[PDB]
Protein backbone atom coordinates (compact mmCIF):
# COMPACT_ATOMS: atom_id res chain seq x y z
CA UNK A 1 0.00 0.00 0.00
CA UNK A 2 2.31 2.78 -1.23
CA UNK A 3 0.99 6.14 0.03
CA UNK A 4 -0.39 8.72 -2.40
CA UNK A 5 0.46 11.72 -0.23
CA UNK A 6 1.82 10.82 3.21
CA UNK A 7 1.85 13.59 5.80
CA UNK A 8 5.19 14.66 7.31
CA UNK A 9 3.83 13.62 10.72
CA UNK A 10 1.00 11.48 12.21
CA UNK A 11 -2.16 13.04 13.60
CA UNK A 12 -1.79 14.63 17.05
CA UNK A 13 1.95 15.12 16.55
CA UNK A 14 3.53 18.49 15.79
CA UNK A 15 5.71 18.97 12.72
CA UNK A 16 8.70 21.28 12.74
CA UNK A 17 11.68 21.16 10.42
CA UNK A 18 13.00 17.64 9.91
CA UNK A 19 11.20 16.11 12.88
CA UNK A 20 7.82 15.21 14.37
CA UNK A 21 7.02 15.82 18.04
CA UNK A 22 4.51 14.22 20.42
CA UNK A 23 3.86 15.85 23.80
CA UNK A 24 2.62 13.49 26.50
CA UNK A 25 -0.72 14.23 28.18
CA UNK A 26 0.40 13.08 31.62
CA UNK A 27 3.53 12.63 33.75
CA UNK A 28 5.41 9.33 34.07
CA UNK A 29 8.92 8.32 35.17
CA UNK A 30 11.74 8.32 32.59
CA UNK A 31 11.61 4.56 31.99
CA UNK A 32 7.89 4.57 31.23
CA UNK A 33 8.30 7.74 29.17
CA UNK A 34 10.95 6.01 27.06
CA UNK A 35 8.78 2.92 26.59
CA UNK A 36 5.92 5.03 25.27
CA UNK A 37 8.08 6.63 22.58
CA UNK A 38 9.68 3.29 21.69
CA UNK A 39 6.27 1.62 21.40
CA UNK A 40 5.46 4.15 18.66
CA UNK A 41 8.75 3.32 16.91
CA UNK A 42 10.10 6.70 17.97
CA UNK A 43 12.36 7.99 20.75
CA UNK A 44 12.54 10.59 23.48
CA UNK A 45 13.28 14.17 22.53
CA UNK A 46 16.84 14.81 21.35
CA UNK A 47 17.66 18.51 20.97
CA UNK A 48 20.44 18.35 18.40
CA UNK A 49 20.09 21.67 16.59
CA UNK A 50 19.27 25.33 17.11
CA UNK A 51 16.05 24.68 15.19
CA UNK A 52 15.14 21.87 17.59
CA UNK A 53 15.93 24.14 20.53
CA UNK A 54 13.98 27.17 19.26
CA UNK A 55 10.90 25.06 18.51
CA UNK A 56 10.90 23.28 21.87
CA UNK A 57 11.52 26.51 23.78
CA UNK A 58 8.49 28.10 22.10
CA UNK A 59 6.34 24.99 22.46
CA UNK A 60 6.94 24.63 26.21
CA UNK A 61 6.53 28.35 26.81
CA UNK A 62 2.84 27.53 27.34
CA UNK A 63 3.79 25.29 30.27
CA UNK A 64 5.59 25.35 33.61
CA UNK A 65 5.82 21.55 33.61
CA UNK A 66 9.10 19.66 33.15
CA UNK A 67 9.52 17.48 30.05
CA UNK A 68 11.85 14.45 30.01
CA UNK A 69 14.34 14.26 27.12
CA UNK A 70 16.25 11.22 25.87
CA UNK A 71 19.33 12.25 27.88
CA UNK A 72 20.68 10.44 30.96
CA UNK A 73 23.74 9.60 33.09
CA UNK A 74 24.12 6.13 34.66
CA UNK A 75 25.94 7.63 37.63
CA UNK A 76 28.57 10.29 38.50
CA UNK A 77 31.42 8.33 36.90
CA UNK A 78 29.68 8.13 33.51
CA UNK A 79 29.07 10.87 30.96
CA UNK A 80 25.74 12.27 29.81
CA UNK A 81 24.52 10.20 26.85
CA UNK A 82 21.53 10.31 24.51
CA UNK A 83 19.49 7.17 23.85
CA UNK A 84 21.39 6.64 20.60
CA UNK A 85 24.64 6.42 22.54
CA UNK A 86 26.05 9.76 21.33
CA UNK A 87 27.56 12.24 23.82
CA UNK A 88 26.01 15.50 24.95
CA UNK A 89 27.62 18.33 22.98
CA UNK A 90 28.25 21.72 24.67
CA UNK A 91 26.68 23.84 21.91
CA UNK A 92 23.02 24.09 22.88
CA UNK A 93 22.83 23.63 26.63
CA UNK A 94 24.31 22.39 29.88
CA UNK A 95 22.41 20.21 32.33
CA UNK A 96 21.91 22.16 35.56
CA UNK A 97 21.37 20.39 38.86
CA UNK A 98 22.72 17.41 40.74
CA UNK A 99 23.60 13.88 39.71
CA UNK A 100 23.57 11.33 42.53
CA UNK A 101 24.73 7.77 43.06
CA UNK A 102 21.82 7.39 45.47
CA UNK A 103 19.32 7.57 42.60
CA UNK A 104 18.21 3.95 41.99
CA UNK A 105 18.22 4.23 38.18
CA UNK A 106 20.69 6.98 37.37
CA UNK A 107 20.06 10.64 36.65
CA UNK A 108 17.90 12.01 33.83
CA UNK A 109 17.46 15.34 32.07
CA UNK A 110 14.29 17.30 31.45
CA UNK A 111 13.68 20.74 30.00
CA UNK A 112 11.51 23.27 31.84
CA UNK A 113 11.03 26.99 31.25
CA UNK A 114 13.88 27.15 28.77
CA UNK A 115 16.59 25.53 30.90
CA UNK A 116 17.60 21.87 31.20
CA UNK A 117 17.93 20.15 34.57
CA UNK A 118 19.14 16.85 36.01
CA UNK A 119 16.81 14.76 38.16
CA UNK A 120 16.22 11.32 39.68
CA UNK A 121 15.00 9.17 36.76
CA UNK A 122 12.27 7.46 38.80
CA UNK A 123 10.34 10.70 39.34
CA UNK A 124 7.36 11.56 37.13
CA UNK A 125 7.17 14.30 34.51
CA UNK A 126 5.63 14.96 31.13
CA UNK A 127 7.79 14.08 28.15
CA UNK A 128 8.20 14.58 24.43
CA UNK A 129 8.70 11.87 21.82
CA UNK A 130 10.34 12.47 18.48
CA UNK A 131 10.90 10.87 15.08
CA UNK A 132 11.89 11.92 11.56
CA UNK A 133 9.18 13.61 9.49
CA UNK A 134 8.25 12.13 6.09
CA UNK A 135 9.66 14.76 3.74
Q: Are 67 and 45 in contact (CB under 8 A)?
A: yes
In the complex with a second copy, the residue whose CB is nearer, 6 or 101, is 6
CA distances from 33 to 9, 81, 135 (A): 20, 17, 26
Q: Which is nearer to a second copy, 65 or 117 (CB)?
A: 65
β partners of residue 6 = none
How many CB atoms neighbour CB 13 within 10 A?
20
Smallest distance from a second copy to CB 122, Å: 20
40: left (phi over 0), alpha (psi -120 to 50) or beta: alpha
Please state the closest distance from residue 43 (CB atom) to a second copy, in A: 20
Give residues in contact with a second copy (CB under 8 A).
Answer: 4-9, 11-17, 23-26, 55, 58-65, 67, 126
Whole-number minimum distance, CB 67 to a second copy, in Å? 8
35 or 54: CB nearest a second copy:
54
Nearest approach in angstroms of CB 32 to a second copy is 16
Amino acid sequence: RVANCSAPCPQDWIWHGENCYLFSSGSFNWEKSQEKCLSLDAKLLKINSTADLDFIQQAISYSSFPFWMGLSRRNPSYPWLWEDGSPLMPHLFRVRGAVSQTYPSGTCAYIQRGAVYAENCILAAFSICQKKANL
